[PDB]
């Protein structure tokens, strides 16, 4: 590497020393990609080795085995695991690919070309070359469009993706006729983010999921070709700061928005994150508590429709803010919860009193593991449910884990976006190091009063 | 001055304020703990408690805090003060609904 006396950056800012070094920058990127794939393979092998087959895939602290299981690799009808060989194959393939990527990153970091323009003009790039940066962005956009179309191919032709909304409690269901309706997809993307709708966490079916993926893959490929064959317009030139730090800040803001968004998928979505693999969401186990106590107390003999609580609102059933019949407990906030074990019990007006009395299914009754433990409580050092629970059961929800972690890292990346956006603006302006001390701007301004 | 409206103009006053604020805060808290040493506590608001005593509708977050303090005392004293030998049964301890 280099020292501070030449680069001007200290050791705790050493990665800035390779801002203008294309080959070393590429080597750092490839080594980091090797790190990501190494974590994927190693953590996959760890979760496979620490997998007990009789338990569901959430009492064991497994977060990414559900990610493979959602694709339909080794998943039975009801949600059983059948075999762990696809998970093992994924882990081993990731480990070997990470070995290759780590070798390439180490090579380009240590003995690769220091700067790429003098020998490899296709890969050489200056940060002020807008056409070259849009070319690289177009290559990556086409790659991401192919990646989304890969999931589309898996859903459509390779007999995959697990549907929770399939009758009987879900099944690995090959998806036919995905909804490619532009009105539906963009009404998903432009709607309110609050409780009534949810902006992006509202997908209740794999048909809309795969239609949106078709749209995003086609758009990404087309935008990649567009960026390959265009140059940014003068309004974009006047609006953006064209430097490697500013581009990083743009990526940081976008990826922090993605981190918050993924935290919200993890907490609320039960379609792209099946309950059989990720445990209950926030709204369920709370809806399940009211549902199971309703069916238990009507199994004893007491009617649930005409039973009122201490406040006179209904111990089991009440009305929502809109006239829908919902569960009468404190779970009136979670009345928007849609689950595979609720919808056949639910009708047009409300919760279908007659269906609650007669048309309850034994599998919906057996789905009380949702309620029993596994409500997304759990404490930091494991232990059971609420903070006042005793050391009885070893469980924290995977949804809780990868929602909390993802919100933390999303907020940190928003902070990093702020830092890098400010420093990029100060670098383009010329005062990243401070004030010139002989002509400061303040002395050229009139005093406020 | 253009962000907050007011700003420091003297480093003397800036650093004296930086000295002054935590010392004054800690001294006021020390005086409060001295007041608590003799159980001379600002526990209640008499007007609020009389209003809520004659009104079954009047509730505030302060009344909620008073109710929470009662539960802290009742459910904490038995295992907190073993000298008092408080073998209180569970039914005389206060409870809400269902918890």
């Amino acid at each position: 590497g280099r020292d501070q006396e030449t680069t001007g950056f200290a050791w705790w800012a050493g990665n800035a020393r390779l801002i203008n070094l294309s080959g070393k920058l590429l080597g750092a990127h490839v080594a980091h990609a090797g790190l990501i794939v190494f974590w994927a393979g190693a953590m996959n092998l760890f979760e496979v080795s620490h997998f007990v087959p009789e338990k569901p895939m959430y009492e064991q602290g497994l977060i990414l085995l559900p990610h493979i299981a959602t694709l339909g690799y080794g998943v039975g009808p009801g949600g059983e695991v059948l075999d762990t060989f696809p998970y093992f194959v994924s882990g081993v393939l990731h480990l070997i690919s990470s070995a290759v990527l780590g070798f390439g990153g180490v090579y380009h970091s240590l003995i690769g070309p220091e700067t790429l323009e003098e020998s490899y003009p296709f890969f050489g790039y200056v940060w002020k070359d807008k056409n070259k940066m849009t070319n690289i962005l177009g290559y990556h956009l086409i790659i991401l469009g192919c990646g989304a179309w890969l999931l589309v191919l898996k859903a459509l032709y390779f007999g995959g993706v697990y549907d929770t909304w399939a009758p009987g409690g879900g099944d690995v269901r090959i998806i036919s006729n995905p909804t490619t309706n532009a009105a539906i997809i963009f009404g998903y993307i432009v709607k309110s983010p609050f409780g009534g709708d949810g902006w992006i966490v509202s997908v209740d079916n794999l048909e809309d999921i795969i239609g949106g993926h078709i749209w995003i893959g086609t758009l990404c490929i087309l935008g990649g070709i567009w960026h390959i064959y265009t140059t940014p317009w003068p309004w974009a030139r006047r609006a953006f700061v064209w430097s490697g730090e500013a581009y990083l800040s743009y990526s940081l803001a976008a990826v922090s928005l993605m981190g918050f968004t993924a935290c919200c998928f993890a907490w609320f979505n039960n379609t792209a994150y099946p309950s059989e693999f990720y445990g209950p969401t926030g709204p369920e186990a709370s809806q399940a508590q009211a549902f199971t106590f309703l069916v238990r107390d009507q199994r004893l003999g007491a009617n649930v429709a005409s039973a009122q609580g201490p406040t006179g609102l209904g111990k089991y059933l009440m009305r929502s803010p809109t006239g829908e019949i919902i569960f009468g407990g404190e779970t009136m906030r979670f009345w928007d919860f849609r689950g595979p074990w609720v919808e056949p019990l639910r009708g047009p007006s409300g919760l279908d009193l007659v269906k609650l009395k007669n048309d309850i299914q034994p599998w919906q009754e057996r789905r009380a593991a949702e309620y029993m433990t596994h409500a997304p409580l759990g404490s930091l050092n494991s232990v059971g449910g609420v903070a006042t629970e005793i050391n009885a059961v070893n469980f924290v929800s995977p949804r809780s884990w990868l929602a909390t972690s993802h919100f933390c890292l999303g907020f940190f990346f928003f902070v990093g976006h702020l830092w890098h956006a400010g420093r990029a603006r100060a670098a383009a302006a010329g005062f990243e190091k401070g004030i010139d001390r002989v002509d400061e701007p303040v002395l050229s301004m009139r005093p406020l009063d | 001055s253009q962000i907050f409206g007011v700003a420091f103009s003297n480093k003397r006053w800036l650093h004296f304020f930086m000295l002054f604020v935590p010392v004054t805060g800690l001294w006021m808290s020390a005086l409060g703990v001295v007041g608590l040493a003799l159980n001379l506590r600002a526990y209640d608001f008499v007007s609020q408690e009389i209003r809520a005593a004659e009104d079954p509708e009047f509730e505030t977050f302060y009344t909620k805090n008073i109710l929470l303090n009662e539960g802290i005392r009742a459910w904490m004293a038995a295992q907190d003060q073993p000298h008092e030998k408080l073998t209180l049964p569970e039914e005389v301890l206060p409870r809400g609904n269902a918890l």
Binding site: P447, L448, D449 | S1, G5, A7, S9, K11
Partner: peptide
């Protein structure tokens, strides 16, 4: 009165901070 005294004290504090923001002494020496 009860609420009137609280309202008067709050708007007095707000008027004080408004005067401090706008009708302050102009800053001198740095």
């Amino acid at each position: 009165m009860e609420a009137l005294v609280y309202t008067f004290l709050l708007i007095g504090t707000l008027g004080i901070i408004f005067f401090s923001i706008f009708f302050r002494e102009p800053p001198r020496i740095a």
